[PDB]
């Protein structure tokens, strides 16, 4: 609710999609080739050769890009699934993904958006760090760090972002010469744990009333 | 990718401390995962030489040694089983400070004077080898500080590389980055060509040039494979997490880690008629060096001879073709394998090697020759032998070629949110070894070097600029937007609204796994085939839920077992109905309750929750958008619910959902002793409502009449209330069922329904005659439709 | 054997909000979703904030006791939520994007007019604001509010605080629903905003009028009687 | 045209009970929202606030609309009895608005949330007890409001 409010107040529309997705929307449309390791059964839950449980809410952003022409300002909260499960990782979790596609969007615009969102979210004028990273769907890309002012009980990685890849737009009929865009992703449980001081991620899916009752 | 900083600094030295370098690395896109010292701290330890040993005359486990530090001979008593004359060892002199505050002092061990100590790797925190004394190379410099000699003033930096930086999977790659980052000279290893001593070659055929456009081969005759790998190489490999196995593998590994070129050596005797670089035949069998017997596919590139396959190209060598103890002659290989042609191939056989990784990520297409010469020199140095000429087989047509990229300054300024100077742009791009030629005002034609497989577009160039400039040095702006006032329709019950309503109504929000146990699924949905996962995490997480009920009930009993009496939970989420072909993924709002109706309190009745408590909760939700009248609760049946206490909820005949008590048989099966009340609503049928349509307020009094109605115990109350409304005329403003009686005062198969009827005329007062008239028509209608009677 | 029927549920059910409250929430949402901040101020105001700052001269008929409720010579009950927009302009420098819902008072009372009522006022002050920007904003707001792609008409009007000014009509052969205009240079100047650098637009609307159009309410007096027979209709 | 804006993500703090939130809570708790005139009869003002001089209008519309309220209670009670006289038994109302405390020099204009209840504790129904509302019913309503931002413990009823 809190993540959505930060953006909906500034013109972002809440977009939803199906949890049972296809290879095109979940991978192909996002510049993830057929031979890419993310597609494997070691990371992705499958029903058959083409149908799966979505690994991210990125397919929702794809379905939006196909349906309409820019401007696009969307936030995509939802349940996502990953085959890699143990402590620190659950087979099901929640993440919010964002997308802004307009005529003159920059990496400076992205930095501004992310830095202000984190400040708004954590209710502090905290330091925000942008480290170069990689994603098939974005270029340039960054891993976003914040200080330990919200503890580990001197930086913490909280989210990722980047400028939408030209091929990602092109594939979804958006001219990369006319339109630029930025996208971002974050894990809801990671954020909740930082916010509320929750140590064990497994408390989120047990539904013990002694846990739940603490958030009244 | 792990490496020795000392070795890196020998190529490109950043002139900043370790801490500064490790910091910057992450800030430029090479995230450091670890930085550790290569050894423990100590002083006063030099290279010593054992001149003679003698048996200690008063202790058999000890030896009396004469050891030189290159300046003086000292008598040291030693108990290590490997101590012998000629041995080069670490000599800790009197005064030397060893790890864990161990100061070497003078000693008289069993009547014999000892002026120092000889050390093991363990004693010095070098390795965990306390088996004996750390035996140093026969040619070690006697007297030199052991930390100096063994390059112990060093760290191992481990980088978590991104798939686009395959070029950084070597010391050559990483040093090129450092040189760019810090604008410092790059001094790569000078690799002099090794001259052929003979003319023996083996022919090489490129039967699949599209998958291997370049292949280099070399004959190395009369190698002594009994010889050891030198310490400098063992240390360099170790500091990169490569364990020493054999001299030949160690060299091919060393060259790969040093330059980035994976190489392979064959036993020349195992090559029949020269090399053939070709695709495998379907079902071709090859035993790897690790013993794995792979059954190959026609899409897989192999290195073969004229008789059979010798290796799976760029991933792993075969057992037969490979070097053994009996090997006297070698055939060295350094080739370029196309990344597209190799992608996923190792994984498809369940394999992953340092070679498969580098080739998949990209190996500099021009590198094979420098690597070949380097490995030739190292092989001759380590195991001797005589080199023949290099056989280079190349396919000019299939060599990788990236068209030059035009970079526009305005596009850099736009993207970065600030302009960069032409000199700065050129300096940065040229440091990365890109070819920058000016193409008019604020435009360049840039060429991509042979080691870079991630650069093909103008945006990749801008990324390089941003990266080396510093992401955190870039400006901050907020995106512009031509925004117009907007809103969703007024008359709608959204899920955030409904959640808060349920909170206010005394519910706790649960979130359960979307995939459940097929056996649990079967209990709630008998006879339905769930949408089952092909690769579930466990077998009890194989079925996609068709109801939020199994998950809610399970969370409810989780709590019951945890000393909870009153459990009131709700969940919202998707249901999965049907198989892929026709699958419906509908959002649901479900709830589950048990225990006392009210929490424990002085002012609260101790009655237990029932159907009508859950009913009020459903009613409150169904009324959230002023459309309660659009819904009807009709007696229905559901396999998970008690058939005597189940309501099917409808809107225009369409199914909204169900409300009822969990079936006692299901409870038995789940070991649930308490009554549980469930509801599940299809959100699509709840969200729409109606906007208020004002109806004028009468200035006149309302008139009420009460009716006590005797009806068959089984006739539904809403059927009667509906008949009453239909027969009450135009002025009825309210109808209330204020009591139900099924006692001794009447027949055991009947019930009394006490109803309150209110009428208000909008333009006048109502008279008693007309109201009694209307009342009698209601009664008459109920006598003919239900054989009703007044009490 | 333990069977039961489909009788009403047990206990308390929901009440509801007042139709004006529903309407104010809705108006605010149209703008808050696009960067507008909700601003509030006092109901007992001074002559400066209520009149002088809004280019209403001392001798102006709106100031008289026939239209304005007074406590003394300088203290009054606010005739509009415009003073809130003034207090905002004094407190900060542009950009300003605010919506000002609230109770307002007028001495003129009888049928069609109540001594107390609610209105929402808007203000946007930035570097390059135009009358085209204002038209766009108003037309899209009304469409959003009435949930229809209705025709919007702009008729020239007058206000001391705005120039140019318009009365805004919508179909159903037309109905006046709100007023707007470009902020007067003197209004900005008085509140330390340079009219050479900054332009702005403001708008005003009556909540009861909008609620009456939306819900089909005939008599404006129903809004302040709080008859449950009226209130219950907006659950 | 639609005006351009360099907008940044923002939000109010998480742990706060806003008035739109509290209104909806009271709705769910069985209350109807009333809006009453800010100026009341001086005699009514005196009944609820003895000894206090109201902030009185110089030109009131009528004399029974001359006093600025120092409580939402006189107005709520009046709306409650308006209904009682109009054949209503169970009247559950709430209002939010300003109170006017003191004379012009020192005047406090504070936002209040007030509620008024009467009649049976529960609506007329087959499954409902015929007990009349009391103090502890209103207490639960205040408790629910006071706990809306997870700070119930910060409050005490003395
Ligand atoms: C950490 O997750 C992330 C980080 C950065 C970008 C994205 C992303 C990009 C897109 C799309 F559809 F526009 F291409 N969807 N999501 C996701
Ligand atoms: C019908 O009400 C309206 C119509 C047009 C303009 C305005 C208005 C202007 C201002 C201020 F303070 F900014 F100058 N406040 N309100 C109000």
Beta-carbon separation of B501 and D25 below 8 A = no
CA distances from B678 to B524, B538, B592, C163 (A): 12, 28, 5, 62
The structure was resolved experimentally with X-ray
Q: For residue D57, is it within any domain?
A: yes
Q: B309, B284 in Cβ contact below 8 A? A: yes
> Both ends of chain C: CA-CA distance in Å?
38
Domain that residue C228 falls in: 17-235
Q: Is B454 annotated as a binding residue?
A: yes
Tokens found for residue B314: 């760029």
Q: Closest Cα partner for B559 from B520, B594, B604? A: B594
Q: B99, B146 in Cβ contact below 8 A? A: no
Provide the number of structural domains found in chain B.
Answer: 6
Measured in residues, chain D has a length of 158
Three-state secondary structure readout of chain C? CCCCCCCCCCCCCCCECCHHHHHHHHHHHHHHCECCEECCCCCEEEHHHHCHHHCCCCCCHHHCCCCCCECCCCEEECCCCHHHHHHHHHHCCCCEEEEEEEEEECCCCECEECCEEEEEEEEEEECCCCHHHHHHHHHHHHHHHCCCCCCEEEEEEEECCEEEEEEEEEECCEEEEEEEEEECHHHHHHCCCCCCCCEEEEEEEEHHHHHHHHHCCCCCCHHHHCCHHHHHHHC
Q: Where are the beta strands (DSSP E) in B112-178?
A: 112-114, 117-118, 155-160
Same domain as B675, residue B707: no
Three-state secondary structure readout of B453-518? CCCCCHHHHHHHHHHHHCHHHCCCCCCEEECCCCCCCCCECCHHHHHHHHHHCCCEECCCCCEECH
DSSP state of B397: G
Tokens found for residue B661: 């008590």
DSSP state of B139: T
Measured in residues, chain B has a length of 791
For residue B443, what are the β-bridge partners? B408
Sign of CA dihedral B609, B612, B618, B620: negative
Among chain B residues, the shortest Cα distance to D127 is held by: B739
Query: What would you measure as the largest C-alpha separation in chain B, in angstroms?
Result: 138
Tokens found for residue B777: 């028509």
DSSP state of B685: G
DSSP B254-270: HHHHHHS---EEEEGGG
Token pair 């019930």 is found at B751
Question: Resolution in A for the shown PDB structure?
Answer: 3.0
State the distance from the centre of ligand 2 to the C-alpha of C160, rounded, in angstroms.
9
What residues of chain D lie within 8 A of the CB of C115, using their CB?
37, 39, 61, 65
Q: Closest Cα partner for C76 from D55, B680, A184, B521? A: D55
* Sequence ranges of the domains in chain A: 1-216
Q: Point out the domain boundary residue: B394, B418, B452.
A: B394
B80: CATH = 2.40.50.140
Q: For residue B567, is it within any domain?
A: yes
Q: For residue D2, is it within any domain?
A: no
Among chain A residues, the shortest Cα distance to C38 is held by: A9
Q: For residue C3, is it within any domain?
A: no
Token pair 């809006």 is found at D35
* Ligand minimally distant from the alpha carbon of residue C164: 2
CA–CA distance, B645 with B667 (Å, rounded to integer): 15
Q: Closest Cα partner for B506 from B574, B604, B575? A: B604
CA distances from B261 to B167, B309, B356 (A): 10, 22, 11
Measured in residues, chain A has a length of 216
CA–CA distance, B160 with B38 (Å, rounded to integer): 19
**Is D7 in a helix, a strand, or coil?**
coil
Among partner residues D10, D13, D147, which is closest to A6 by beta-carbon distance? Answer: D10
Give the side-chain half-sphere CA count within 13 A for D35: 21
Q: Closest Cα partner for A36 from A45, A23, A54, A48? A: A23
Q: Closest Cα partner for B675 from B633, B638, B641? A: B641
Give CB contacts under 8 A, 24+ apart, made by C183-187.
C183/C123, C183/C125, C184/C55, C184/C160, C186/C55, C187/C53, C187/C54, C187/C55, C187/C161, C187/C162
Q: For residue C9, is it within any domain?
A: no
Q: For residue D125, is it within any domain?
A: yes
Q: Which residues contact C108 (CB under 8 A, 6 or more apart)?
A: C66, C67
CA distances from C107 to B398, B779, C115, C117, D61 (A): 90, 55, 6, 11, 6
Q: C16, C231 in Cβ contact below 8 A? A: yes
DSSP A157-208: EEEEEEEEPHHHHHHTT--TTT-EEEEEEEEHHHHHHHHHT---TTHHHH--
Q: B317, B333 in Cβ contact below 8 A? A: no
CA–CA distance, D34 with D96 (Å, rounded to integer): 8
Q: Point out the domain boundary residue: B662, B690, B718.
A: B690
Q: B40, B146 in Cβ contact below 8 A? A: no
CA–CA distance, B53 with B67 (Å, rounded to integer): 9
Measured from the Cβ of residue C105, the count of other Cβ atoms closer than 10 Å reads 25
B81 phi/psi in degrees, rounded to 5: -65, -15
> Both ends of chain A: CA-CA distance in Å?
15
Beta-carbon separation of C32 and A9 below 8 A = yes
CA–CA distance, B205 with B207 (Å, rounded to integer): 6
Residue whose CA lies nearest to ligand 2 atom number 15:
C82
Among partner residues A6, A11, A215, which is closest to D11 by beta-carbon distance? Answer: A6
Q: For residue B300, is it within any domain?
A: yes
CA–CA distance, D50 with D61 (Å, rounded to integer): 24
CA–CA distance, C137 with B444 (Å, rounded to integer): 45
Beta-carbon separation of D14 and A11 below 8 A = no
For residue D100, what are the β-bridge partners? D109
Angle between helices B717-727 and B768-786 (to 10 degrees): 140
Cα A216 to chain center, whole Å?
A: 27
Q: B596, B606 in Cβ contact below 8 A? A: yes
Q: Which residues contact B19 (CB under 8 A, 6 or more apart)?
A: none
The CATH number of the domain covering residues in A1-216: 3.30.930.10
Q: Closest Cα partner for C183 from C233, C123, C101? A: C123
Q: Closest Cα partner for B28 from B189, B156, B168, B171? A: B168
- φ/ψ bin of B343: left (φ > 0), alpha (ψ from -120 to 50), beta (otherwise): beta
Instruction: Please count the helices (runs of H) and the strands (runs of E) in chain D.
Output: 4, 7
Distance from CA of A6 to the nearest CA of B (A): 14
CA–CA distance, C192 with B776 (Å, rounded to integer): 77
CA distances from B665 to B527, B642, B669, D8 (A): 17, 9, 6, 56
Question: Which burial class, exposed, middle or buried, applies to D21 when counting CB atoms under 10 A from its CB (0-12, 13-18, 19+)?
Answer: middle
Q: Where are the beta strands (DSSP E) in chain A?
A: 13-14, 20-22, 51-53, 72-81, 92-102, 128-135, 138-147, 155-164, 180-187
CA–CA distance, B281 with B288 (Å, rounded to integer): 17
For residue B530, what are the β-bridge partners? none
Peptide bond into A71 cis (omega under 30): yes
For residue C139, what are the β-bridge partners? none
* Interface mutation vs chain B, best among C9, C32, C127, most B CBs within 10 Å: C9
Cα C209 to chain center, whole Å?
A: 10
Q: C203, C180 in Cβ contact below 8 A? A: yes
Provide the number of structural domains found in chain C.
Answer: 1
Tokens found for residue B222: 């009369």
Q: What is the dihedral of CA C154, C158, C162, C166, to 10 degrees?
A: -10
Q: Which residues contact B657 (CB under 8 A, 6 or more apart)?
A: B588, B649, B679, B680, B681, B682, B685
Token pair 């950043």 is found at B14
D142: CATH = 3.30.930.10
Domain that residue B713 falls in: 699-791
Question: Which burial class, exposed, middle or buried, applies to B250 when counting CB atoms under 10 A from its CB (0-12, 13-18, 19+)?
Answer: buried
Strand order in the sheet with B567-577: B508-509, B567-577, B584-594, B677-682, B654-662, B641-651, B631-635
Same domain as B724, residue B648: no
Q: A120, D11 in Cβ contact below 8 A? A: yes
* Ligand minimally distant from the alpha carbon of residue A139: 1
Q: B209, B398 in Cβ contact below 8 A? A: yes
**Is B303 in a helix, a strand, or coil?**
strand
* Ligand minimally distant from the alpha carbon of residue A143: 1
* Interface mutation vs chain B, best among D127, D129, D134, D150, most B CBs within 10 Å: D127
Q: Closest Cα partner for B337 from B324, B353, B323? A: B353
C193: CATH = 3.30.930.10
Tokens found for residue D156: 């005490």
Same domain as B532, residue B442: no
CA–CA distance, A129 with B17 (Å, rounded to integer): 22
Q: Kindly state the helix (H) or strand (E) to which residue B341 belongs, with its residue range.
A: helix B339-342
Same domain as B739, residue B645: no
Q: Where are the beta strands (DSSP E) in B365-404?
A: 386-387, 391-394
Q: Which residues contact B89 (CB under 8 A, 6 or more apart)?
A: B47, B48, B49, B50, B67, B83, B118, B119, B133, B134, B135, B136
Alpha helix (H) residue ranges in B118-170: 146-149
CA angle C17, C21, C24 (to 5 degrees): 150
Pocket flag, ligand 2, residue C201 (CB < 6 Å): no
Beta-carbon separation of C71 and D56 below 8 A = yes
Give the side-chain half-sphere CA count within 13 A for B268: 19
Q: Which residues contact B509 (CB under 8 A, 6 or more apart)?
A: A212, B499, B502, B503, B569, B570, B571
For residue A131, what are the β-bridge partners? A143
Same domain as B462, residue B432: yes
Where chain D is discontinuous (C–N > 2.5 Å), the residues before each break are: none
Token pair 């999977």 is found at B169
Cα B107 to chain center, whole Å?
A: 58
What residues of chain D lie within 8 A of the CB of B754, using their CB?
126
Tokens found for residue B624: 């959230």
Q: Closest Cα partner for B3 from B288, B241, B335, B297? A: B241
Token pair 């290879």 is found at A23
Q: Closest Cα partner for B500 from A188, A216, A192, A214? A: A216
User: Which atom of ligand 2 lies closest to the CA of C86?
Assistant: 12
> Both ends of chain B: CA-CA distance in Å?
91
B776: CATH = 3.30.70.380
CA distances from A94 to A90, A190, B351, B514 (A): 10, 9, 33, 12
Q: B704, B609 in Cβ contact below 8 A? A: no
């Amino acid at each position: 609710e809190r993540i959505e409010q930060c953006f909906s107040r500034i013109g972002y529309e809440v977009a939803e999609g199906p949890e049972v997705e296809d290879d095109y929307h979940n991978f192909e449309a996002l510049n993830i080739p057929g031979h890419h390791p993310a597609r494997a059964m070691h990371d992705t839950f499958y029903f058959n050769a083409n149908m799966l449980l979505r690994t991210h809410t990125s397919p929702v952003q794809v379905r939006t890009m196909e349906s309409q022409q820019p401007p696009i300002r969307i936030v995509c909260p939802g349940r996502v699934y990953r085959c890699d499960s143990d402590l620190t990782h659950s087979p099901m979790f929640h993440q919010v993904e964002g997308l802004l596609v307009d005529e003159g969007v920059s990496f400076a615009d992205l930095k501004g958006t992310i830095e202000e969102f984190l400040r708004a979210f954590f209710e502090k004028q905290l330091e925000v760090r942008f480290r170069p990273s990689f994603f098939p769907f974005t270029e340039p890309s960054a891993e976003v760090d914040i200080q330990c002012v919200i503890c580990s009980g001197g930086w913490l990685e909280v989210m990722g972002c980047g400028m939408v890849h030209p091929n990602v737009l092109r594939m979804s009929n958006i001219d990369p010469e006319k339109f630029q865009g930025f996208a971002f992703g974050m894990g809801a449980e990671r954020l909740a744990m930082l916010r509320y001081g929750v140590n064990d991620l497994r408390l989120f899916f047990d539904n013990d009333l002694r846990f739940l009752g603490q958030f009244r | 990718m792990k490496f020795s900083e000392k070795w890196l600094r020998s190529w490109a030295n950043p002139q900043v401390s370790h801490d500064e370098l490790v910091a910057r690395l992450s800030m430029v896109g090479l995230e450091v995962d670890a930085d550790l010292p290569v050894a423990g701290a100590f002083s006063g330890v030099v290279v010593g030489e054992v001149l003679s040993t003698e048996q200690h005359p008063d202790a058999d486990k000890l030896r009396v040694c004469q050891v030189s530090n290159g300046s003086e001979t000292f008598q040291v008593v030693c108990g290590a089983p490997n101590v012998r004359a000629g041995l080069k060892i670490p000599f800790a002199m009197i005064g030397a400070e060893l790890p864990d505050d161990f100061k070497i002092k003078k000693a008289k061990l069993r009547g014999v004077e000892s002026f120092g100590m000889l050390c093991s790797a363990k004693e010095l925190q070098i390795s965990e080898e306390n088996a004996g004394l750390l035996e140093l190379p026969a040619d070690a410099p006697v007297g030199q500080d052991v930390r100096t000699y063994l390059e112990l003033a060093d760290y191992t930096i481990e980088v978590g590389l991104t798939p686009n930086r395959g070029d950084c999977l070597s010391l050559a790659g990483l040093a090129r980055e450092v040189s760019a980052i810090y604008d410092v000279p790059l001094a790569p290893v000078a690799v002099d060509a090794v001259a052929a001593q003979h003319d023996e070659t083996r022919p090489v055929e490129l039967a699949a040039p599209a998958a291997c456009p370049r292949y280099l081969g070399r004959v190395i005759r009369n190698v002594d494979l009994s010889r050891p790998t030198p310490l400098w190489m063992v240390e360099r490999l170790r500091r990169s997490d490569i364990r020493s196995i054999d001299p030949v593998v160690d060299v091919t590994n060393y060259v790969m880690i040093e330059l980035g070129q994976p190489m392979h050596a064959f036993d020349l005797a195992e090559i029949n008629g020269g090399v053939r670089v070709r695709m495998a035949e379907d079902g071709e069998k090859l035993v790897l060096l690790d013993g794995q017997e792979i059954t190959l596919r026609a899409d897989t590139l192999v290195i073969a001879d004229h008789q059979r396959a010798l290796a799976i190209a760029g991933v792993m060598g075969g057992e037969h073709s490979g070097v053994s103890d009996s090997t006297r002659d070698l055939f060295l290989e350094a080739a370029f394998f196309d990344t597209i042609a190799l992608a996923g191939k190792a994984r498809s056989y369940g394999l992953h090697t340092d070679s498969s990784h580098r080739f998949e990520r990209g190996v500099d297409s021009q590198l094979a020759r420098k690597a070949m010469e380097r490995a030739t020199r190292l092989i001759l140095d380590i195991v001797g032998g005589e080199p023949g000429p290099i056989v280079e087989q190349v396919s000019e047509a299939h060599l990788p070629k990236v068209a030059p990229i035009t970079l526009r300054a305005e596009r850099v300024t736009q993207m970065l949110g600030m302009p960069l100077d032409a000199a700065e742009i050129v300096r940065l791009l040229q440091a990365l070894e890109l070819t920058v030629v000016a193409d008019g005002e604020g435009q360049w034609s840039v060429g991509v070097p042979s080691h870079r497989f991630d650069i093909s577009l103008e945006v990749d160039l801008i990324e390089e600029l941003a990266r080396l400039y510093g992401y955190n040095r870039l400006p901050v702006r907020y995106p512009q937007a031509r925004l117009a006032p907007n809103n969703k329709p007024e008359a709608r019950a959204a899920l955030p609204l409904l959640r808060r309503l349920l909170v206010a109504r005394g519910y706790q929000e649960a979130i359960t796994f979307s995939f459940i146990d097929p056996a649990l699924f079967e209990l709630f949905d008998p006879g339905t085939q769930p949408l089952t996962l092909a690769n579930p995490i466990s077998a009890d997480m194989a079925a996609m839920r068709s109801s939020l009920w199994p998950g809610l009930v399970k969370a409810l009993q989780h709590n019951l077992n945890r000393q909870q009496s009153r459990v009131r939970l709700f969940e919202s989420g998707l249901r999965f109905v049907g198989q892929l072909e026709g699958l419906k993924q509908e959002a649901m709002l479900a709830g589950a309750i048990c225990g006392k109706r009210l929490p424990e309190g002085w002012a609260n009745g101790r009655d237990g929750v029932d159907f009508f408590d859950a009913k009020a909760d459903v009613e409150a939700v169904l009324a959230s958008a002023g459309a309660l009248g659009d819904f009807s609760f009709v007696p229905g049946e559901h396999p998970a619910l008690h058939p005597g206490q189940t309501a099917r909820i409808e809107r225009e005949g369409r199914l909204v959902g169900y409300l009822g008590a969990l079936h006692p048989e299901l409870a038995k099966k789940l070991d649930l002793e308490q009554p549980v009340f469930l509801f599940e609503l299809l959100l699509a049928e709840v969200v729409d409502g109606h906007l208020p349509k004002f109806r004028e307020l009468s200035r006149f009094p309302e008139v009420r009449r009460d009716l006590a109605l005797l009806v068959d115990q089984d006739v539904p109350a809403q059927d009667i209330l509906t008949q009453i409304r239909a027969a009450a005329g135009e002025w009825l403003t309210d109808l209330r069922l204020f009591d139900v009686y099924h006692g001794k005062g009447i027949d055991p198969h009947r019930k009394s329904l006490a109803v309150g009827l209110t009428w208000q005329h909008p333009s006048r007062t109502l008279n008693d005659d007309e109201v009694n008239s209307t009342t009698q028509n209601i009664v008459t209608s109920l006598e003919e439709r239900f054989n009703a009677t007044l009490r | 054997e333990r069977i039961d029927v489909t009788l009403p549920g047990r206990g308390q059910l929901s009440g509801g909000l007042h139709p004006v409250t529903r309407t104010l929430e809705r108006i605010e949402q149209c703008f808050s979703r696009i960067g507008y901040e909700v601003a509030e101020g006092p109901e007992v105001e001074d002559d400066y904030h209520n009149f002088e700052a809004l280019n209403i001269p001392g001798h102006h008929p709106a100031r008289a006791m026939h239209d304005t409720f007074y406590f003394n010579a300088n203290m009054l009950l606010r005739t509009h939520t415009s003073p809130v927009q003034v207090r905002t302009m004094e407190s900060q420098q542009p950009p300003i994007r605010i919506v000002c819902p609230g109770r307002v008072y007028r001495c003129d009372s009888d049928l069609t007019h109540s001594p107390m009522f609610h209105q929402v006022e808007g203000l946007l002050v930035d570097e390059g604001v135009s009358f085209a920007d204002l038209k766009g904003t108003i037309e899209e707001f009304l469409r959003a509010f009435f949930e229809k792609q209705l025709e919007v008409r702009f008729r020239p009007s007058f206000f001391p605080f705005t120039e140019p000014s318009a009365e805004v009509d919508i179909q159903c052969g037309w109905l006046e629903v709100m007023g707007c205009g470009m902020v007067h240079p003197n209004v900005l100047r008085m509140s330390n905003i340079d009219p050479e650098k900054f332009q702005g637009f403001a708008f005003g609307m009556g909540a009861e009028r909008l609620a009456m159009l939306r819900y089909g309410v005939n008599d404006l007096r129903l809004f302040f009687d709080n008859d449950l027979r009226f209130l219950g209709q907006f659950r």
